[PDB]
Write a protein that binds this DNA or RNA. Structure first.
Ligand SMILES: [Mg+2]
Ligand SMILES: [Mg+2]
Length: 324
DNA sequence: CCGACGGCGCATCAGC
DNA sequence: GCTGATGCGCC
DNA sequence: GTCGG
């Protein structure tokens, strides 16, 4: 990419503030700056040029002048040398280990992959599975594999009840050639904003995917959200596919468009769009868009994703243009 | 200068 | 047991 | 860390 050196720098700074400093707004600031620079169509010549972009301020502009001048950032060079910071940053790469547990493990002298493996009894269930599939979960999923996965999920959901609709969202719906995981939006006519006319709607689908050995592990599960592990079947004699993260979100059928807007993302696109909604006097979640009175009002009618954009005076952006 | 920064599901825990 | 925080995760 | 007012 045109400015990949800079955007990598800012992402590494972002991860430092989140994982080590526990400063979530600096993390968001860095990631917003990284995103706006990533889609800037010119090779950046100076911090001043970057500062013209929204989300890039004086401090990042200075860092960008240092990086352009030398190819590196002393502040990051120092961080890479700090053992506590390096340890904490590594541990947070395990699913279920966040900034707080990472610092706690380091305190207890648990700071390497070998440390984790011989202390599995100190991990909660999520963390145990995150450690189990540590290597697999850092691999990306080719779109060709995502298509196979889509076919299995949609056909197995159909077998449970022909009235389910499963939509693959996330980066896959944005047209990405590789994804970090699979995100599945699920609806059923029995589950609306007005009534839940049938229990276990999510459970039945999860069970069926487990029965056919597609879902292999559960990280968490409730009435509307499943987070777990899945795996494509492999053919005779060939190596197994890596295990993959799968999220399933059951959304009220009448709120499909808000739900598919949310689950298509990107995460940064959602933060940008919801912030713009607020500036326009609305609030958007995965169910509704409501006016601000500063208390939310009643949900506004929505019959398309585009209706949501219209409310906040944004021209419509197809999924493939939401990769911020 | 300084308040706000998107919004929410599930797991875990503390206090009652 | 319930309620409310907090941690971690999803986009 | 950046922005808006
Ligand atoms: Mg995804
Ligand atoms: Mg996901």
């Amino acid at each position: 990419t045109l400015n990949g050196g800079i955007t990598d720098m800012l992402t590494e700074l972002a991860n430092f503030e989140k994982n080590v400093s526990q400063a979530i707004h600096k993390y968001n600031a860095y990631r917003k700056a990284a995103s706006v620079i990533a889609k800037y169509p010119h090779k950046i010549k100076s911090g001043a040029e970057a500062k013209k972009l929204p989300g890039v301020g004086t401090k990042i502009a200075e860092k960008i002048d240092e990086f352009l001048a030398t190819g590196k950032l002393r502040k990051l060079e120092k961080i890479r040398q700090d053992d506590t910071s390096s340890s904490i940053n590594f541990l947070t790469r395990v699913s279920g280990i966040g900034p707080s547990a990472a610092r706690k493990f380091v305190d207890e002298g648990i700071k390497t992959l070998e440390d984790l493996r011989k202390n599995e009894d100190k991990l909660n269930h999520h963390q145990r599975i995150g450690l189990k599939y540590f290597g697999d979960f850092e691999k990306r999923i080719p779109r060709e594999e995502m298509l196979q996965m889509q076919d299995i999920v949609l056909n197995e959901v159909k077998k449970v009840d022909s009235e389910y609709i499963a939509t693959v969202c996330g980066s896959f719906r944005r047209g990405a050639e590789s994804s970090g995981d699979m995100d599945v939006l699920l609806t059923h006519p029995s589950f609306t904003s007005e009534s839940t006319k049938q229990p276990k709607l999510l459970h039945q689908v999860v069970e069926q995917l487990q029965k056919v050995h597609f879902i292999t592990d559960t990280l968490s599960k409730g009435e509307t959200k499943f987070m777990g592990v899945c795996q494509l079947p492999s053919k005779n004699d060939e190596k197994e596919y890596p295990h993959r993260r799968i999220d399933i979100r059951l959304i009220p059928k009448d709120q499909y468009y808000c739900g598919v807007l949310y689950f298509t993302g990107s995460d940064i696109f959602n933060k940008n769009m919801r912030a713009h909604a607020l500036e326009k006097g609305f609030t958007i979640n995965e169910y509704t868009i409501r006016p601000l009175g500063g208390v939310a009002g009643e949900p506004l009618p929505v019959d398309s994703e585009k209706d949501i954009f219209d409310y906040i005076q944004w021209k419509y952006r197809e999924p493939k243009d939401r990769s911020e």
